[PDB]
Design a protein around this ligand. Structure first.
Ligand code: GTP
Ligand code: GTP
Ligand code: GDP
Ligand code: GDP
Ligand code: MG
Ligand code: MG
Lengths: 430, 48, 427, 55, 430, 427
């Protein structure tokens, strides 16, 4: 029918994927084994009898995270070939995960993803997960996109990546790894979405009253966006949005593709008791800087085209009125070569409520994908961090030792400079 | 012992109160878009 | 499958390692007789890191024990966990230690080195994978200081890729137990700087100070001191053995913490430490763990961080905790004390979390840092080396073993260059 | 994940030490130490009575 | 329908408010939990349940007063978002509540009031409460009005404040805060009402029969006046008065807006055994200086336009005779250029009594709002007290240290002097 | 969440503070073992102001005890409520007090200063918020006056915004326990004027006078006298701990009562104090409290208000009571005695009401006032200081510690100017 392939790279990818496939199996009604006690085929293959197998490939250069699943409850769910593990991790070193370690396992990875695609008669895109600071997320992720571009060409390659936070940081060499990977992403990726832990932490504490979140809580929120993103191909509605529609509607140019995400409503059970949460309220909550999953103020820049997705008993009359209201906010700035400004989407399947969840049952929910020039702030933040280290050659010896050539460091600095120029040039006056 | 000099403390207090230093300092923080090398090659690369 | 080879050299290294295996065997649940009788399946996941299995359910550690005289060897043999070790792994000479660096490196070291390396080769080639080597030795002695560096050069020659992590004990600043330490330490530094990837320095005097200030110990024997050190050894490699939310192994630690090839000497610490009786008054939470970690008194090396500046720092967390709580605390401690961190390196604090804490504790943490305060320690030994060397004095005992006076001049020159390098990057 | 989030966390979670020397506080915990010789008094009395017999 | 939003500031505003809302919920027939055992839309909103929610926001810079509601019986009625509490109060310092501590929470509150106005389809005005002597009441109230003026603009912002008493005082720095606040109030407020505690003590002991009152009894009397003011929008009547009508009829100029309050009959009801309390009786009782809620005698000044509000059994025939009689009274003056002088309204619903009550269940009552030049007496006292302290600069160092500049002290002192002659020129006739 | 850190200095500080925690623990209902066994939910509302909790439901006060000799604390620890305090907050030296201000300031103060500050840093940075510190000490001694002022400067430098409220006991005029008191008090004032925000003056003679006049105690001990002081400390912070009709915390008091930065010394008084036989005659009414608070005999400082004029006055009331009745009394007492009030400040009486009364009482009140009568107390010790200084008296003891003779001249000049400052504003 219509299909999409999910690939998880590094700890931050596979750990999110564990929560995602929990939500998807529960939504469709498939037990963790893969049997039953529809849209199954867009995510799963039916091996026969009554068993289902997901379309996922788990990859990391160290076996600890994958062996958790292999020993976990879901071990029978997956194909053992899908679960791919290396021997020793990349040690947060881009050169180590791209030149030395990455190339030993890349061809094994490409066979299984290509073998998985043969069974997919009507495949229409890929979903790939990174963390920018990781060696495997960046070093191995770059090598994977480069090969898939020639392997599959004009197939939409969508990415869901964790953006390095402004102040929260767990890797010291983190700015070095992001810039080198950014060069490979910018040419090959069709569109790559941004989320960051720092904003999700604050959102998980304010809107949801979870004072002290873990990585587990944040993975469920990301799972709901992908569920809402892919729900148009699965369940019935009134305005269907395919993957290819995202590629044309969101990005005006080739190098300005990076969007940001938002979701509404996110509310605890004891707050939703007092709130109706109709169409007007959920539309307004999206555009507050508090709800953005990337910690950048939209008021710093301007907005180009946005895409909105609704899941619930939503009537088209209310959708047009809410966006009409959104255009009346003078605190929201749009660019005048984007007077259209919007694409809408409506679907009837409500959000899925995982048992023991942190989310209240809401009857309609809206997801927002928006592209803005506010993220030019974030690149200038990351660019400055790189300069201080490289002025004194702070960590070059580790990279050079693992096959990396030093000449790529200024070239990667050059490409980011052009990307920074492209934003102010786009955001410039008509 | 040397006696203190007579001083009109009310006049000095009258003058001093406008001069009281503020407790909390202000902070207008520059945005990184304002960087002097925005969209252009940093100068330190040639030395590197 | 990230096996680690352990080597014990000298009296100081051997007895610390003997206590070190008690800590691990308790944590995994391995009997002194090498039997497993534990309580959790998670202990058997990656026991392969430190142990080999003998047919019959008997587990034998990857330990190689080295000495020049069998005096300390028999003490370990009669120990509580003496039966654990592999009997053929005991390698020893038949001559007095001499407490002479030249004698240990040149006279007896050459004869013992050829046997020691092949015993290492037995264990290093026996396993499916090998990440790095683990050495415990002191720097003021004659066997560990000399033979340890000799073996370190050979291990570098044969295994260039592997991480050569070593743990060293530094002679005390006020009172120390050897007349000729400045010669031994200055000679040893030249080898350690160029050969070892990671070196951890621990001082005896800080260990006594930790015992009385925090632990209140009335009569702290060497067992309590060896207890403190082995916890840090257990904390570092725990990321290999047990799962967690964010894994961080040795090579991650080396890449993050070491900005330049020669600035890789580290200070260590551990938290929490029970003031016995008092901690009924203490509430242990994640912020409280951070307070002890970055408190200057809990550092195990007698170099004050406040008199220098930090370059990199890293902390591990063990137990179930909030991930946001850890990440906020690193931001909090870094922002409140900006004077002690360098500007040209943003986000100077690395973090890590692991799920399985040591038995009984809800949470525990380990701190590893790199700072310019090490210039205090190297100035100490250089100054003593200088005024001994001018009078010549005990050089008479090193000349008759085949060591040239130019080696003293080269050793000081390399040591002083290390000092200036730490000075320059302070700017 | 309620245990980490809840504010009665300090109330409910059992404390780290109980009377003499808890059976769940193993050696790896690093809280059982040997330097507190609570047998010092008895050893001291025995040693002098050993000295008294010698004298 | 038509909506009014209530904002409460400080200890006075919050704990006056819970007195007001216990009145309205009992009046409409809503249990404290929001369930039931009409005009609900004017003050409440309905959710996806049989549950209601007030249109109110409680604001204070210290948590003690608000937390009493949070643990009280009424905790289930309010939305958790509506109750906003700071960390440390302003310590009766206007500068601390305006610049340093006020700006720490201003934007958090402004989102919540704006969000509530979205649910108000027919919003027509706001209600805001102050106590002048408090730091939060004057300092943060000024910052709130300045922002609200540009946010909404042409909407009627009505205020209900407690003027510092002529002799009773609880703060030594009290004159400083009132004058600085008066500057911000005068330009932005559409219309604000004066009452003072000293008159409310005297009325509650003389008319009502209580030996020893508390703030609880005074807070209930204030609620009755607001109840009568808002009864026109809620229940039926032969002559309705909207909020916008009060703005135009009462104030002759921009800067002379400040009216005073009165109410009749206020009676300890054993005294109500003796009398029938006809329309003429209650109309006469309004104009005695003893019944004024502000302790200034109108006989020193003159009357401009007055507004009369009748509730209950009153009939339009009897009103006309009564007001005609009060015009014949030669103890009451009116300025020459206001021959009309009156605005009348009649509503059918009599007042509502409360358990543990203080008042009677009488069948008819009347409420008054009058603008008089006698208020110029109060300004002279406050100005005189301000000059005594300021000549020797008795408390300036506290204000300047908390972000205040000294030049604001005389400039705020100049405008009140202009207001003092504003009242003197208007008091003249030609 | 307005946490307060409590610091006790000297023999006077430790004895007063130990009795202070007996008062609060009973009020909130904390068993001396440290566990809650109370009777009302309102007690657990805002216990965070003074107590931290340890894992296991045990509450520990935010107390730091400071002395130069360990004699006093072992007496305090052996007291009934000694187990409550954290063992590691006890900071002491191993040297005699010496009854010397210079010795306390320079010789022994510097050694203990660094250790004490980090103990403060633990408690100051362990809470979500911090409003101010609280110091209890005497001025006639050497440890409370000497090290107390040195710690006062360091607290101001690190934490400028926070309120450094101090409670002081002034040496008595008739019979006093130390010869060299004029030296210690004169030097101490210079530090208190510039650093501390609020100062309360307590004289031992007035405490004796109140005990024999009102309470008719035939043999009062230091327990009786210290109990009276503890009530005022409990009363002032009661607005933070319990709800009320009109709140007034520490920062409100400083804003209202202090017109100029250097005039912040205060006198305190507490009502109702009732004799054993007068209780059957005294009908407890709000006017009855007003008579006691403004009665001159109830002043706890031996400086007569009638000899001076009032600048500001403040009264707190505890219990469920009428707001009209309290406000009317403030106006009545102000208008009846206008000869003792300044013209250029009207409404000199500030008022507040609190809901929950102290244990055993239905209604209670607290008074804090600021007046020019302090010129009596400073003139007294200035007169004694001058004669002891005109000839060089015991002075050589101070010079042999490091103190320069010009510091005495600076100490008097600063103190004398504060006397003149109150003289001018009386006009
Ligand atoms: N949201 C979320 N982020 C995670 C999670 N785990 C790790 N991360 C993020 O991952 C980033 C670092 O990437 P890595 O964890 O090192 O992943 P990697 O690509 O495998 O890198 P290596 O482990 O060195 O091979 C950090 O900034 C974390 O914020 C998770 O469970 N949830
Ligand atoms: N009528 C009435 N007046 C009150 C009440 N509570 C306080 N007041 C008056 O409020 C005035 C002082 O203002 P505050 O109570 O300090 O209010 P605030 O703005 O919160 O002051 P801050 O504590 O600095 O925030 C006094 O004159 C009181 O008479 C009340 O419940 N009813
Ligand atoms: N921590 C610790 N240190 C020890 C122990 N035994 C000896 N040392 C110290 O180790 C230092 C040098 O040891 P040494 O005997 O010379 O080792 P060698 O090089 O093998 O000869 C001495 O200063 C001792 O204080 C021990 O059991 N524990
Ligand atoms: N009110 C009160 N005063 C005390 C107490 N103990 C001592 N004092 C007085 O404090 C004064 C000085 O005390 P001192 O011994 O010098 O304390 P130091 O600061 O530790 O040296 C003496 O005059 C005592 O009368 C007490 O428990 N209560
Ligand atoms: Mg990885
Ligand atoms: Mg307030």
């Amino acid at each position: 029918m219509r299909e999409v392939i999910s690939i998880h790279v590094g700890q931050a990818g596979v750990q999110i994927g564990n929560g995602c496939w929990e939500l998807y199996c529960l939504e469709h009604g498939i037990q963790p084994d893969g049997q039953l006690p529809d849209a199954f085929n867009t995510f799963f293959s039916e091996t026969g009898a009554g068993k289902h197998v997901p379309r996922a490939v788990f990859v990391d250069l160290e076996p600890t995270v994958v062996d958790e699943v292999r020993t976990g409850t879901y071990r029978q769910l997956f194909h053992p070939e899908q679960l791919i593990s290396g021997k020793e991790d990349a040690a947060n070193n881009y050169a180590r995960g791209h030149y030395t370690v990455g190339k030993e396992i890349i061809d094994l990875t490409l066979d299984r993803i290509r073998k998985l695609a043969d069974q997919c008669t009507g495949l229409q895109g890929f979903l790939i997960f990174h963390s920018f600071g990781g060696g495997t997320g960046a070093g191995f992720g770059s090598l994977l996109l480069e090969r898939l571009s020639v392997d599959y060409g004009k197939k939409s390659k969508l990415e869901f990546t964790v953006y390095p936070s402004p102040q929260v940081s767990t890797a010291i060499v983190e700015p070095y790894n992001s810039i080198l990977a950014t060069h490979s992403m910018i040419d090959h990726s069709d569109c790559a979405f941004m989320v960051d832990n720092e904003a999700l932490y604050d959102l998980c504490r304010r809107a949801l009253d979870i004072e002290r979140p873990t990585y587990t809580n944040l993975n469920r929120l990301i799972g709901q966006v992908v569920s809402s993103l892919t729900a148009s191909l699965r369940f019935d509605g009134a305005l269907n949005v395919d993957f290819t529609e995202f590629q044309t509607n969101l990005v005006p140019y080739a190098r300005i593709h990076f969007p940001i995400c938002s979701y509404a409503p996110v509310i605890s059970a004891e707050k939703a008791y007092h709130e109706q949460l109709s169409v007007a309220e959920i539309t307004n909550s999206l555009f507050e800087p508090a709800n953005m999953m990337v910690k950048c103020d939209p008021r710093h820049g301007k907005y180009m085209a946005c895409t909105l997705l609704y899941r619930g008993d939503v009537v088209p009359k209310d959708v047009s009125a809410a966006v009409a209201t959104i255009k009346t906010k003078r605190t929201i700035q749009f660019v005048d070569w984007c007077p259209t400004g919007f694409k809408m989407g409506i679907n009837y399947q409500p959000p899925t409520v995982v048992p023991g969840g942190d989310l209240a049952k809401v009857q309609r929910a809206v997801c927002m994908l928006a592209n803005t020039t506010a993220i030019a702030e974030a690149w200038s933040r990351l660019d400055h961090k790189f300069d201080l280290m490289y002025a004194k050659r702070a960590f070059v010896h580790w990279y050079v030792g693992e096959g990396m050539e030093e000449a790529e460091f200024p070239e990667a600095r050059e490409d980011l400079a052009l990307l920074e120029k492209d934003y102010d040039e786009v955001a410039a006056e008509s | 012992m040397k006696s203190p000099t007579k001083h009109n403390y009310i006049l000095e207090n009258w003058k001093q109160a406008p001069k009281t230093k503020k407790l909390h300092p202000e902070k207008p923080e520059t945005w990184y878009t304002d960087k002097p090398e925005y969209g252009q090659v940093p100068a330190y690369l040639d030395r590197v | 499958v990230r096996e680690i080879v352990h080597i014990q050299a000298g009296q100081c290294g051997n007895q610390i390692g003997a206590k070190f295996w008690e800590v691990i065997s308790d944590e995994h649940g391995i009997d002194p007789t090498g039997s497993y009788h534990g309580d959790s399946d998670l202990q058997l996941e990656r026991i392969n890191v430190y142990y080999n299995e003998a047919t019959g359910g008997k587990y034998v550690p990857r330990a190689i024990l080295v000495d020049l005289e069998p005096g300390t060897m028999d003490s370990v043999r009669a120990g509580q966990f003496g039966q654990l070790f592999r009997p053929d792994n005991f390698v020893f000479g038949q001559s007095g230690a001499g407490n002479n660096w030249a004698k240990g490196y040149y006279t007896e070291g050459q004869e013992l080195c050829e046997s020691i390396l092949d015993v290492i080769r037995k264990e290093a080639e026996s396993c499916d994978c090998l990440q790095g080597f683990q050495l415990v030795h002191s720097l003021g002695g004659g066997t560990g200081a000399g033979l340890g560096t000799l073996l370190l050069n050979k291990l570098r020659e044969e295994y260039p890729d592997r991480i050569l992590s070593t743990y060293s004990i530094v002679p005390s600043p006020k009172v120390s137990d050897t007349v000729v330490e400045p010669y031994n330490c200055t000679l040893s530094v030249h080898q350690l700087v160029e050969s070892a990837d990671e070196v951890f320095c621990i001082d005896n005097e800080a260990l006594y100070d930790i015992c009385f200030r925090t632990l209140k110990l009335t009569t702290p024997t060497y067992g309590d001191l060896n207890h403190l050190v082995s916890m840090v050894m257990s904390g570092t490699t725990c990321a290999l053995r047990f799962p967690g939310q964010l894994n961080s192994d040795l090579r991650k630690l080396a890449v993050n913490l070491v900005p330049f090839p020669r600035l890789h000497f580290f200070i260590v610490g551990f938290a929490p430490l029970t003031s016995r009786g008092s901690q009924q008054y203490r509430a242990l939470t994640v912020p409280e763990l951070t307070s002890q970690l970055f408190d200057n008194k809990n550092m195990m090396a007698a170099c004050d961080p406040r008199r220098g500046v930090y370059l990199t720092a890293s902390a591990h967390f063990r137990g179930r905790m909030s991930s946001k709580e850890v990440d906020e605390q690193m931001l909090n401690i870094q922002a409140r004390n900006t004077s002690y961190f360098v500007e040209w390196i943003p986000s100077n604090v690395k973090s890590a979390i692991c799920d399985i804490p040591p038995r009984g504790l809800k949470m525990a943490a380990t701190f590893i840092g790199n700072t310019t305060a090490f210039r205090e320690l190297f100035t100490r030994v250089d100054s003593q080396f200088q005024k001994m060397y001018a009078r010549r004095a005990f050089i008479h005992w090193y000349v008759n073993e085949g060591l040239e006076t130019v080696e003293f001049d080269e050793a000081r020159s390399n040591m002083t260059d290390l000092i200036q390098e730490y000075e320059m990057y302070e700017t | 994940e309620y245990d980490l989030n809840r504010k009665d966390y300090i109330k409910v979670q059992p404390q780290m030490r109980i009377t003499d020397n808890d059976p769940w506080l193993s050696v790896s915990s690093g809280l059982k130490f040997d330097g507190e010789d609570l047998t010092a008094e008895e050893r001291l009395k025995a040693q002098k009575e050993q000295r008294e017999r010698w004298g």
